[PDB]
Amino acid sequence: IVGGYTCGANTVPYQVSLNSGYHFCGGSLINSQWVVSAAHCYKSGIQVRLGEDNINVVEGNEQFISASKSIVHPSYNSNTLNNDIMLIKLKSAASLNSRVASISLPTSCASAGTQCLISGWGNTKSSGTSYPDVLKCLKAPILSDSSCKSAYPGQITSNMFCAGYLEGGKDSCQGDSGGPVVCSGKLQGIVSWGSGCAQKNKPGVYTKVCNYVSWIKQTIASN
Ligand SMILES: [Ca+2]
């Protein structure tokens, strides 16, 4: 997250870190046994780390649980990043409490102008590299479909939305991928892509979660 703030320990209780020896992506806990993340975060050997603030210090609220199964969206395309969504089943159910909690799925899509909370352990510089140890947060609005398509000609599908600031300076970044965009207490987006980070006229692009709720629910019901 570029241009954000320190969330506060365990204030984003659905935020997970995907670990393969090191943090490599975010995710969101959607029930005791399932995480939503970005398909472009897929790899084998994932450990889901719940209850994290400092990803380099054991602080006392962590739950570390291995993935038992990963399911990339059937229609994911890694060239275009269309359908940039994946589900991860945990080997055991997480213990849910005030600091480790699921986030509601949307029943309705969000609109341009809604404020949302974007979080992660990704890069905090736009023309530099600095990776934080504690979770970072950004409040940002959803942008119009037309401004999104104007920023990224020929690249925005019906499964993507933009959020952020066209002036630059405030955005998600590398290492935030897979993490949440939460608007009015609902998971509306997944950190997906963008040209650089926090660049003028290059807002963040997010997977549009409300398009996937039927797939998510039926996948959970059968797995
Ligand atoms: Ca920790």
Side-chain angles (χ1 to χ4, degrees), residues 15 31 53-54 63-64 76 89 92 104 120 137 152 156 160 167 175 179-180 190 202 210 214 222:
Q15 174 84 50
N31 61 43
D53 190 49
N54 193 318
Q63 299 175 49
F64 295 174
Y76 172 57
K89 188 178 183 186
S92 60
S104 292
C137 276
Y152 291 106
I156 302 300
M160 298 170 193
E167 60 265 43
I190 301 167
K202 295 291 175 184
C210 63
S214 297
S222 287

Side-chain angles (χ1 to χ4, degrees), residues 9-220:
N10 311 112
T11 61
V12 188
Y14 52 83
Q15 174 84 50
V16 319
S17 171
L18 303 187
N19 185 289
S20 61
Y22 45 85
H23 171 81
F24 68 87
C25 273
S28 308
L29 191 65
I30 54 163
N31 61 43
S32 68
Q33 302 180 273
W34 290 85
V35 167
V36 162
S37 184
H40 86 255
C41 293
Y42 164 78
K43 61 164 63 182
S44 57
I46 299 176
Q47 191 182 56
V48 173
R49 303 191 162 201
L50 305 313
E52 289 281 17
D53 190 49
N54 193 318
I55 51 165
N56 276 320
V57 179
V58 177
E59 300 177 297
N61 295 293
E62 298 92 346
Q63 299 175 49
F64 295 174
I65 308 173
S66 296
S68 56
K69 170 188 284 189
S70 296
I71 306 172
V72 168
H73 190 278
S75 297
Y76 172 57
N77 181 310
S78 54
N79 295 323
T80 64
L81 299 178
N82 199 25
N83 307 295
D84 192 15
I85 189 169
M86 71 172 323
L87 287 162
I88 302 164
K89 188 178 183 186
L90 303 184
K91 275 198 182 165
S92 60
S95 297
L96 302 179
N97 54 236
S98 63
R99 298 179 174 77
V100 175
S102 57
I103 186 71
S104 292
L105 293 174
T107 57
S108 139
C109 303
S111 304
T114 302
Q115 281 289 319
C116 305
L117 181 67
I118 307 181
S119 47
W121 291 273
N123 190 1
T124 64
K125 302 314 228 325
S126 53
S127 56
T129 297
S130 183
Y131 285 84
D133 298 307
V134 300
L135 188 65
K136 301 289 179 168
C137 276
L138 176 65
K139 292 181 182 189
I142 300 179
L143 298 175
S144 59
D145 188 44
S146 55
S147 68
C148 188
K149 291 170 162 173
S150 288
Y152 291 106
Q155 299 159 68
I156 302 300
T157 74
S158 64
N159 301 308
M160 298 170 193
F161 68 92
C162 288
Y165 297 92
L166 295 179
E167 60 265 43
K170 286 165 127 193
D171 195 5
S172 58
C173 201
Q174 280 68 45
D176 294 315
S177 293
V181 180
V182 164
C183 321
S184 306
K186 311 302 184 162
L187 182 69
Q188 295 282 9
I190 301 167
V191 179
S192 184
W193 62 275
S195 184
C197 310
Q199 302 301 296
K200 191 184 171 189
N201 293 139
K202 295 291 175 184
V205 189
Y206 298 94
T207 309
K208 190 172 177 170
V209 172
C210 63
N211 293 5
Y212 295 102
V213 172
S214 297
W215 171 75
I216 294 170
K217 286 179 174 282
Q218 76 93 353
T219 299
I220 291 169

